[PDB]
mmCIF file of C-alpha atoms and ligand atoms in Angstrom:
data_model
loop_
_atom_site.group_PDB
_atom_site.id
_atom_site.type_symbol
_atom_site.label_atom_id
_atom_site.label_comp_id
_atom_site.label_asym_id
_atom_site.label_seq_id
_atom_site.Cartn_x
_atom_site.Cartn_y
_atom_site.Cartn_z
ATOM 1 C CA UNK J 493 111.514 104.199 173.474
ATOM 2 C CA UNK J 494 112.611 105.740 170.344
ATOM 3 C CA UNK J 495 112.496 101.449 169.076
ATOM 4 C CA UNK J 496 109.051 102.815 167.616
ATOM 5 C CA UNK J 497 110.992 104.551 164.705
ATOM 6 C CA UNK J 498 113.208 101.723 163.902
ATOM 7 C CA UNK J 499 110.802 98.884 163.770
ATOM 8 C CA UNK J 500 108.466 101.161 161.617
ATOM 9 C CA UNK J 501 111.489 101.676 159.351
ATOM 10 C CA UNK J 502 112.178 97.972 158.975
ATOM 11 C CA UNK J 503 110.278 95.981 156.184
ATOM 12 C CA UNK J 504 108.184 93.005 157.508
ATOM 13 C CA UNK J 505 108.629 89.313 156.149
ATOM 14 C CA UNK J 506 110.397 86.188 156.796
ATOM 15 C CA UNK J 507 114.309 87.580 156.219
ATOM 16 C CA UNK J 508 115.772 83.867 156.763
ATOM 17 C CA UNK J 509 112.927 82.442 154.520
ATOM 18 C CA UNK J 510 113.460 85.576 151.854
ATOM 19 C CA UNK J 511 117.448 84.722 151.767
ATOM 20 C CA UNK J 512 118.977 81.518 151.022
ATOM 21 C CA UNK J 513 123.164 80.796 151.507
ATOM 22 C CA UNK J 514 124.627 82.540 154.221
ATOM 23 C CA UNK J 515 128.244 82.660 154.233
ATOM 24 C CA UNK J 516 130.213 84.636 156.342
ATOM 25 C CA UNK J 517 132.290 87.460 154.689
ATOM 26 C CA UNK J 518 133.437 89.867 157.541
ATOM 27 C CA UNK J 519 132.891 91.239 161.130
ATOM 28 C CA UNK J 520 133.455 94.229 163.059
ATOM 29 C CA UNK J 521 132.234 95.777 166.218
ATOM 30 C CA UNK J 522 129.068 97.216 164.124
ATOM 31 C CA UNK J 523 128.474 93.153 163.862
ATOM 32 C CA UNK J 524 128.729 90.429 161.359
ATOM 33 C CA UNK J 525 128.634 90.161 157.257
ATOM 34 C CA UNK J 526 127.211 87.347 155.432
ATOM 35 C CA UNK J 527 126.861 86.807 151.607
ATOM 36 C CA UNK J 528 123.042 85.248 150.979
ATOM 37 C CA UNK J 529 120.943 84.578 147.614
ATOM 38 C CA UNK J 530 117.871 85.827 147.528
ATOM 39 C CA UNK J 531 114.832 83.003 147.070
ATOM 40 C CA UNK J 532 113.511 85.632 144.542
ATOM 41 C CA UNK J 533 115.433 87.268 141.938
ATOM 42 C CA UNK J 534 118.454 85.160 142.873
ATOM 43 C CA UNK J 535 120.213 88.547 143.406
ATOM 44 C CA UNK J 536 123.014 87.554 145.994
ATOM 45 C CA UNK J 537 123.033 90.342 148.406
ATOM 46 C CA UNK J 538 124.933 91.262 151.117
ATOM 47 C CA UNK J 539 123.351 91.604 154.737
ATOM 48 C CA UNK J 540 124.914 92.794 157.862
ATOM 49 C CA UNK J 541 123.356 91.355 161.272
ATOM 50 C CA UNK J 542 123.656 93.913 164.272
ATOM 51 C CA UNK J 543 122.739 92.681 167.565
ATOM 52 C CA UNK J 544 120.674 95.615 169.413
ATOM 53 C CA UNK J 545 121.580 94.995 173.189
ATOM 54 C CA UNK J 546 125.429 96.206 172.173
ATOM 55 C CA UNK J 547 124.369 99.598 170.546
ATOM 56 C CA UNK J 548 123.049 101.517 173.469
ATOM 57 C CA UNK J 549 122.686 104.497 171.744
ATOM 58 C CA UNK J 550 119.715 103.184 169.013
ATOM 59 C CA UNK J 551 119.499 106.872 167.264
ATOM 60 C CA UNK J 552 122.621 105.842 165.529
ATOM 61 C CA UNK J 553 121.124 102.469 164.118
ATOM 62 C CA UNK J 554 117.936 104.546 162.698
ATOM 63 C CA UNK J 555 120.794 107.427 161.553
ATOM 64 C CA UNK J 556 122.355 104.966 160.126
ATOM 65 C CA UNK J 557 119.624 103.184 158.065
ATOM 66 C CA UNK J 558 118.344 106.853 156.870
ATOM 67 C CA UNK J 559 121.610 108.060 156.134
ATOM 68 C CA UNK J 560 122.331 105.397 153.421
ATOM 69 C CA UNK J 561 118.973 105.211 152.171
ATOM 70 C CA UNK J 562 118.596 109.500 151.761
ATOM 71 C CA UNK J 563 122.418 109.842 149.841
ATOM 72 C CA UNK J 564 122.544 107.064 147.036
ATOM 73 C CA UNK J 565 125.548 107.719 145.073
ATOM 74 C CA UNK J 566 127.837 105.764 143.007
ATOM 75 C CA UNK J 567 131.145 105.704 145.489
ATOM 76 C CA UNK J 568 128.566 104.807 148.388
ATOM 77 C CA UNK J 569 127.808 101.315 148.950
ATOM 78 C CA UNK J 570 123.478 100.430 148.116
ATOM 79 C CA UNK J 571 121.172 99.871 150.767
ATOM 80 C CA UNK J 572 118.374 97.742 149.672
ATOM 81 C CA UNK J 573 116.060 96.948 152.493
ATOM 82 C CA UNK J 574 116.232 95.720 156.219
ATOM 83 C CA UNK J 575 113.991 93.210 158.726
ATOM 84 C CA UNK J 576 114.343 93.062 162.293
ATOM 85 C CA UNK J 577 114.346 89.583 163.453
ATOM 86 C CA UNK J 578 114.422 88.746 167.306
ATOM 87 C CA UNK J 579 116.987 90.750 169.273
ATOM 88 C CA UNK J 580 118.773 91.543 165.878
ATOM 89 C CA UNK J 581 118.616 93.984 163.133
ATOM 90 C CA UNK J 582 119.150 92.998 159.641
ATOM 91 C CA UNK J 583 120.614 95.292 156.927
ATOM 92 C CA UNK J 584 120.589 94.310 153.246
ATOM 93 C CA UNK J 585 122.631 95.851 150.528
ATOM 94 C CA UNK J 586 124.271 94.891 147.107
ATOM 95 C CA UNK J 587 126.957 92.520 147.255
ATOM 96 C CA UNK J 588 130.039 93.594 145.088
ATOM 97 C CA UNK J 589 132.671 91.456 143.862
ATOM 98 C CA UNK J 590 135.843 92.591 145.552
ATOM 99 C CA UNK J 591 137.713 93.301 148.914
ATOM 100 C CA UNK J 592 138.406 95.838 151.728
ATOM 101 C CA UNK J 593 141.340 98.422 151.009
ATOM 102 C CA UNK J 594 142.597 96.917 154.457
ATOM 103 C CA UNK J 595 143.932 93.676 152.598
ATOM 104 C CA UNK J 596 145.292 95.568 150.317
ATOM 105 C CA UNK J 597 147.256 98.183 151.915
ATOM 106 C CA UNK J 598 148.820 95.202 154.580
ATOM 107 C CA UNK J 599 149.579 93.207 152.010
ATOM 108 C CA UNK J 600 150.659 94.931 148.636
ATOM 109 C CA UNK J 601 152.624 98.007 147.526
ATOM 110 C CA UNK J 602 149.963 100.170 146.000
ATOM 111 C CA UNK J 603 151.719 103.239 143.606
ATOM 112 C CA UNK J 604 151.163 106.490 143.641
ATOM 113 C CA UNK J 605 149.135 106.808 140.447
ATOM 114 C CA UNK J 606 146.928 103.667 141.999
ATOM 115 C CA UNK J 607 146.536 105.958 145.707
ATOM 116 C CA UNK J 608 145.459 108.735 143.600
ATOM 117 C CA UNK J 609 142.357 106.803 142.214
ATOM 118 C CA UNK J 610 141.452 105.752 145.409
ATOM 119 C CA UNK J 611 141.673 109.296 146.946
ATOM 120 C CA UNK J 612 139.477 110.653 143.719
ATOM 121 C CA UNK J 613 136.634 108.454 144.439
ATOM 122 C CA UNK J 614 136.675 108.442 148.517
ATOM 123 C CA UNK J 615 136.679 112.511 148.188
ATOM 124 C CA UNK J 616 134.058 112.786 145.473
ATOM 125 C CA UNK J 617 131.990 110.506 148.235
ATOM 126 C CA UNK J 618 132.742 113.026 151.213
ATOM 127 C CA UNK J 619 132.007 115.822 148.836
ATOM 128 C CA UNK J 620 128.834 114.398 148.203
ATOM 129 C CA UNK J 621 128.369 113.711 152.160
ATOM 130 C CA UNK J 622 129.084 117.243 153.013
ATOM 131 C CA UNK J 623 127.470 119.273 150.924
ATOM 132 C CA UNK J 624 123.986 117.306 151.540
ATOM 133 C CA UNK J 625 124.999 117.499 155.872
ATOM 134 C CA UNK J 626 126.315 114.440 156.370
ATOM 135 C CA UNK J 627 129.661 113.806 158.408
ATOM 136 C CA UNK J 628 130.909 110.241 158.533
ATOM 137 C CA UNK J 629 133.775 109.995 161.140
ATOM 138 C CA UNK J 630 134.927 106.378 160.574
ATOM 139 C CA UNK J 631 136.986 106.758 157.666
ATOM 140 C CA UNK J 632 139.402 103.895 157.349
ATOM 141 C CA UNK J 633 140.404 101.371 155.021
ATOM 142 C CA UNK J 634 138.761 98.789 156.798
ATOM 143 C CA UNK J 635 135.952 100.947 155.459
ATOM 144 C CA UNK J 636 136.312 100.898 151.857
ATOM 145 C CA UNK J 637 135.175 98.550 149.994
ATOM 146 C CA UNK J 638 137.107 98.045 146.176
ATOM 147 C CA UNK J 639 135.203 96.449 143.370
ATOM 148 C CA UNK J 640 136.819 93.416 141.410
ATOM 149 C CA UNK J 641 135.041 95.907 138.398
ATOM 150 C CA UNK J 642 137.564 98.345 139.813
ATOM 151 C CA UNK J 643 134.924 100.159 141.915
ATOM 152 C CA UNK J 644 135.704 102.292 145.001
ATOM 153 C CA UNK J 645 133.035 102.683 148.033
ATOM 154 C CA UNK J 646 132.409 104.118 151.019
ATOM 155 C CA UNK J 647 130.681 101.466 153.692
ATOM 156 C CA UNK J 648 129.812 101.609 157.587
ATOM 157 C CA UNK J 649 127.494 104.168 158.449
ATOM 158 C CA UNK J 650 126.957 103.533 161.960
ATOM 159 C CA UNK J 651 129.196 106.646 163.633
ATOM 160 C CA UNK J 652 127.460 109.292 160.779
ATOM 161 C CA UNK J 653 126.322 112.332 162.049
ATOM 162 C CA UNK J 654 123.881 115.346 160.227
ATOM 163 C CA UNK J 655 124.469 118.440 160.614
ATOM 164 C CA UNK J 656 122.453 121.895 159.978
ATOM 165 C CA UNK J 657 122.592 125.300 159.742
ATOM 166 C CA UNK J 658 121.823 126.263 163.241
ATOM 167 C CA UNK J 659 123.905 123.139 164.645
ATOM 168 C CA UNK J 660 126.549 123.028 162.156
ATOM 169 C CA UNK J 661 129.736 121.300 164.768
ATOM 170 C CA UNK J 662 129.434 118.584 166.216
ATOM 171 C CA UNK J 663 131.011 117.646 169.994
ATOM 172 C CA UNK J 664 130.850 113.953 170.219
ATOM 173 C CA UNK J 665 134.535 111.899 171.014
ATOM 174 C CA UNK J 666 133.561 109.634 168.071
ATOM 175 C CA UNK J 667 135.694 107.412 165.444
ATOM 176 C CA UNK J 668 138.452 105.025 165.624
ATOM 177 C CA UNK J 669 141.452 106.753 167.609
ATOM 178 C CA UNK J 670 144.475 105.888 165.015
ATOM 179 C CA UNK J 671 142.117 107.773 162.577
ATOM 180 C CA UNK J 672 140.899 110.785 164.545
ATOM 181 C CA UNK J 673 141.397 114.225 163.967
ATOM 182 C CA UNK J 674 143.367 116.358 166.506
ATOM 183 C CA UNK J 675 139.704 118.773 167.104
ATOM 184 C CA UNK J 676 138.171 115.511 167.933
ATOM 185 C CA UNK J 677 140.962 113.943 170.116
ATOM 186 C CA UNK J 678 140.682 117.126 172.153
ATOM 187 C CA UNK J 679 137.453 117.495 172.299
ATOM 188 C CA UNK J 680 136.545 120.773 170.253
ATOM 189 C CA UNK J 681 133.540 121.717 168.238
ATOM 190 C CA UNK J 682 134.456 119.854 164.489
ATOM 191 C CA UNK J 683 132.609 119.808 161.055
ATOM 192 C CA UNK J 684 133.382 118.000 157.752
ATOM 193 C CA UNK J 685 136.576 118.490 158.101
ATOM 194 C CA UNK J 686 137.322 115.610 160.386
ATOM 195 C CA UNK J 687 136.917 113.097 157.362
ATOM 196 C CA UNK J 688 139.344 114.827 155.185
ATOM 197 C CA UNK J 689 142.407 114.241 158.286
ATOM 198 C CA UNK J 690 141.046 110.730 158.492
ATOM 199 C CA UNK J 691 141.344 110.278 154.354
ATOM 200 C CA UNK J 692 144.910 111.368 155.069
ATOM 201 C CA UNK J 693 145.473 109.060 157.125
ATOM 202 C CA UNK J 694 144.462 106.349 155.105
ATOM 203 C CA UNK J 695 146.902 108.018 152.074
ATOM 204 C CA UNK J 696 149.537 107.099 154.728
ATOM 205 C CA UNK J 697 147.702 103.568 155.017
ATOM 206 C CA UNK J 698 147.936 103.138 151.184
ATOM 207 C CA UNK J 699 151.613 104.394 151.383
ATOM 208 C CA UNK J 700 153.251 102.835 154.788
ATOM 209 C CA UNK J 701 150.970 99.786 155.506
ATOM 210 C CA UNK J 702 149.488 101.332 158.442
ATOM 211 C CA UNK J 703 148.131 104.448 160.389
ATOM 212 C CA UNK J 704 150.558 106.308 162.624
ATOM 213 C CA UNK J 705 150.900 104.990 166.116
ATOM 214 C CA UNK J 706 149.199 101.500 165.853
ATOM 215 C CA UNK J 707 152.218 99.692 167.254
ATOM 216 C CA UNK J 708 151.040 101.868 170.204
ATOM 217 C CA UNK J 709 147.896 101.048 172.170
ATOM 218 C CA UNK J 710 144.660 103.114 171.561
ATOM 219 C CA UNK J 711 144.800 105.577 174.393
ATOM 220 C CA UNK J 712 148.587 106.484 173.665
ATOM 221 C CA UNK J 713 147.372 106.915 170.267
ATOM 222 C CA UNK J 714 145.215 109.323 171.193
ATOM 223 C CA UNK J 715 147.672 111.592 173.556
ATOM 224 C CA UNK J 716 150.139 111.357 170.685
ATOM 225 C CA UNK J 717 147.497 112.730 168.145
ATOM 226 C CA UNK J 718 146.862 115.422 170.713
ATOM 227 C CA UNK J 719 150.568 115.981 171.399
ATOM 228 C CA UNK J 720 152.477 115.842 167.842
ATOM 229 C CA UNK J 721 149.631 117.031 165.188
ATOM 230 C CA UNK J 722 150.442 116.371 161.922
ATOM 231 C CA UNK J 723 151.614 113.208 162.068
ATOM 232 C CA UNK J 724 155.331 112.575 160.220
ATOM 233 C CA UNK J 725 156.232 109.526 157.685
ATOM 234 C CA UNK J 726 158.552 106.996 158.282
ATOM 235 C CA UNK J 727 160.398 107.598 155.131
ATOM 236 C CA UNK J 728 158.840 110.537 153.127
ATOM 237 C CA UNK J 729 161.425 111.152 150.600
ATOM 238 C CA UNK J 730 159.847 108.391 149.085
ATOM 239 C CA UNK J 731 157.262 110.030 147.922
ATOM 240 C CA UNK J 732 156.606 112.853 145.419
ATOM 241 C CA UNK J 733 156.385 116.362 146.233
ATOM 242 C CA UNK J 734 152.265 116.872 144.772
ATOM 243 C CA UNK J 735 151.737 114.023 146.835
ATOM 244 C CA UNK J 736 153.748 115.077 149.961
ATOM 245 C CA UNK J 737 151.788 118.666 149.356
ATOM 246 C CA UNK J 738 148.493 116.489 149.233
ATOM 247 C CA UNK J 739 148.844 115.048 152.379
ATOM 248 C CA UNK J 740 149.856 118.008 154.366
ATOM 249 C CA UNK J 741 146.531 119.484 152.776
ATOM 250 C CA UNK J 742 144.728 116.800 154.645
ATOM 251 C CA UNK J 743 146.305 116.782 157.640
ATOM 252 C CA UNK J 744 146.704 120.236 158.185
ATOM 253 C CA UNK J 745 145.992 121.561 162.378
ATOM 254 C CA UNK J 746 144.481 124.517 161.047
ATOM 255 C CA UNK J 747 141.142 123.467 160.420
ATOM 256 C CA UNK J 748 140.376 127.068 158.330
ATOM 257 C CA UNK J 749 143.002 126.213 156.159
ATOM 258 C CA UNK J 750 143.020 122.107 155.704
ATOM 259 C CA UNK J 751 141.289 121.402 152.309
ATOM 260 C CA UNK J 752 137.523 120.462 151.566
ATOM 261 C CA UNK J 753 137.106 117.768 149.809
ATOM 262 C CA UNK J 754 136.120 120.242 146.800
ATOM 263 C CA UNK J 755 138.796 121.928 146.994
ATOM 264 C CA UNK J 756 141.230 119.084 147.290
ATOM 265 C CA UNK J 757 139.370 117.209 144.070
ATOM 266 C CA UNK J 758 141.008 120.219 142.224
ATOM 267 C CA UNK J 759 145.086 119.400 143.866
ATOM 268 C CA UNK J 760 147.427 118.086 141.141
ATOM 269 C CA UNK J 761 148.124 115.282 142.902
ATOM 270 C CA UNK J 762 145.287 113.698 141.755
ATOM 271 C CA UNK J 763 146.125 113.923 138.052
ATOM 272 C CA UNK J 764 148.528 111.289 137.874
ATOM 273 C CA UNK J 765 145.294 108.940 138.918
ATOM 274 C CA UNK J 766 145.370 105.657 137.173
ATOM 275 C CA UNK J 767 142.381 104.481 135.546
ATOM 276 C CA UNK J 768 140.064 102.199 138.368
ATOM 277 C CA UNK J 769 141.080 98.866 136.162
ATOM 278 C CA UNK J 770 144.652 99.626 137.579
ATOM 279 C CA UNK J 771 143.161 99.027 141.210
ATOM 280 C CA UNK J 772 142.232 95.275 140.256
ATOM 281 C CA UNK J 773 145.903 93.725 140.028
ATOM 282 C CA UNK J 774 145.745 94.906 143.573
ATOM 283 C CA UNK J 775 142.612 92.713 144.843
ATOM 284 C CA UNK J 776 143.727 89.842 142.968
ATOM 285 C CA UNK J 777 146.609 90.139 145.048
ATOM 286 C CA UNK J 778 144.946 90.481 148.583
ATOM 287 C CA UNK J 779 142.308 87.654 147.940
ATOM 288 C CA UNK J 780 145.909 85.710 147.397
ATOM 289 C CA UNK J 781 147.759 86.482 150.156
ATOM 290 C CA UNK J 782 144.801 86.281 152.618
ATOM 291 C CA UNK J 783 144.092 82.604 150.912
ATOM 292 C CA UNK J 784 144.404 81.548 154.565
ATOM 293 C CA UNK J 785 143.821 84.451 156.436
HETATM 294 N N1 LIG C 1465 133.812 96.990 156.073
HETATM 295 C C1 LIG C 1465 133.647 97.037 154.594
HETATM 296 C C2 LIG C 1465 132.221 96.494 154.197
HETATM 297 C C3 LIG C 1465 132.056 95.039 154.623
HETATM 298 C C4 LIG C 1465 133.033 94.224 153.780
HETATM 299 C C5 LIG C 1465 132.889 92.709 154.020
HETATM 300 N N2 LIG C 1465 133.829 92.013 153.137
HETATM 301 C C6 LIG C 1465 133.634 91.805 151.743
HETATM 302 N N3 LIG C 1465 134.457 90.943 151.174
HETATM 303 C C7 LIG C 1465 134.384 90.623 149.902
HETATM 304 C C8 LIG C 1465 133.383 91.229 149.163
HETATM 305 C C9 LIG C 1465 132.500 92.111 149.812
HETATM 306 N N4 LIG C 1465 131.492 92.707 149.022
HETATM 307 C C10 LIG C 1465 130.549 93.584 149.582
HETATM 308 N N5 LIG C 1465 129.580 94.116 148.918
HETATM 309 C C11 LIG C 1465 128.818 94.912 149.637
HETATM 310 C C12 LIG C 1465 129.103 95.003 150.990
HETATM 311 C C13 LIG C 1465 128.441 95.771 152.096
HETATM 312 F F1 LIG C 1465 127.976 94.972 153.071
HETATM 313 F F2 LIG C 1465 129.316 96.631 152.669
HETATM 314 F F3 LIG C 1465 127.424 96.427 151.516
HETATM 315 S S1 LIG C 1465 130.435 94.042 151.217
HETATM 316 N N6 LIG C 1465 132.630 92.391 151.090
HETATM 317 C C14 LIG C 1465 134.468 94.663 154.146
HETATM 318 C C15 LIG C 1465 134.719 96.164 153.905
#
């Protein structure tokens, strides 16, 4: 009964009698996404609801909470408050304008100059992570979050882990498998690192439509992570050779020499980054072609 933490975390009040206007925006495993107005203020926020009886493992809900609350930064999205209600958790944060990097990646061309921006602000996030002990392990596209202002974000907590000094690897089979580093997919000690494979393989996201493997099922994914490594392109004489030296940065086996995201801030490759306005064309696009879906 570690439940004393979390409801002593949680702000009291009436959350359904605070918020006014819910409209579903998105849903995942970690639960569903609404858009609300707040009663006062008339700040529109946006507030996840995450049903308690599916997480068994409640450390991760309180991680979570503290993790976003302890590391405000511009590229991570802005807790605000949260309520438990019922059999339900409720998690509040600042609704921005915009869309997932999933829509756009499955349903636009993105150039090199515009994967460069994205890269810039997801790695000045992790740098930020890492250096105050924080490891995410769910980086994906359906985990960014782009601002119609041009903004880029970092969103879904729930997997984080902390790290120290004295327990500086982690050993947990955590993530989502097309995503996964090799040292996690075979169940070694892992750091940091980890998140700068899984930025990779969003660059190959941003430049093929999808992660290697997801024709596959999940469990073949994972033996073929295990089994090949780095994972190869479809068609990489398409891209340049800074980027092509980028991503083999990031997706290096050798976890000594794979780049931190400090280093890798510093690679050439992301010179040729557009400014963020370059990133909107994009999201108009997405909201388009998903008018339907
Ligand atoms: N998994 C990531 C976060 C959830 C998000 C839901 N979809 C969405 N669609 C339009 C706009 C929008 N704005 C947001 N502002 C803040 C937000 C969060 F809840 F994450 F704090 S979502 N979100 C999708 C991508």
């Amino acid at each position: 009964e570690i439940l004393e933490k979390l409801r002593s975390i949680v702000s009291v009040g009436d959350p359904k009698k605070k918020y006014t206007r819910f409209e579903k925006i998105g849903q995942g495993a970690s639960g569903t996404v609404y858009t609300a107005m707040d009663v006062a203020t008339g700040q529109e926020v946006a507030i996840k609801q995450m049903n308690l009886q599916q997480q068994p493992k409640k450390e991760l809900i309180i991680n979570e909470i503290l993790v976003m609350r302890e590391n405000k930064n511009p590229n991570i999205v802005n807790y605000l408050d949260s309520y438990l209600v019922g059999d339900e958790l409720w998690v509040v944060m600042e609704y921005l304008a915009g869309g997932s990097l999933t829509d756009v990646v499955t349903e636009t061309c993105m150039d090199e100059g515009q994967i460069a921006a994205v890269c810039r602000e997801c790695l000045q996030a992790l740098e930020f992570l890492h250096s105050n002990q924080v490891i995410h392990r769910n980086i994906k596209s359906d985990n960014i979050l782009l601002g119609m202002d041009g903004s880029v974000k970092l969103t879904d907590f729930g997997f984080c882990a902390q790290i120290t000094p004295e327990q500086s690897k982690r050993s947990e089979m955590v993530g989502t498998p097309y995503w996964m580093a090799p040292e996690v997919v075979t169940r070694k000690a892992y750091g940091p690192k980890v998140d700068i494979w899984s930025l990779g393989i969003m660059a190959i996201e941003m430049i093929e439509g999808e992660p290697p493997y997801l024709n596959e099922n999940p469990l073949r994914a994972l033996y073929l992570i295990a089994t090949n490594g780095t994972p190869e392109l479809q068609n990489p004489e398409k891209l340049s050779a800074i980027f092509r030296d980028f991503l083999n940065r990031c997706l290096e086996m050798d976890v000594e020499k794979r780049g931190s995201a400090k280093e890798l801030l510093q690679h050439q490759f992301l010179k040729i980054a557009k400014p963020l306005s370059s990133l909107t064309p994009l999201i108009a696009a997405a909201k388009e072609a998903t008018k339907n879906n």
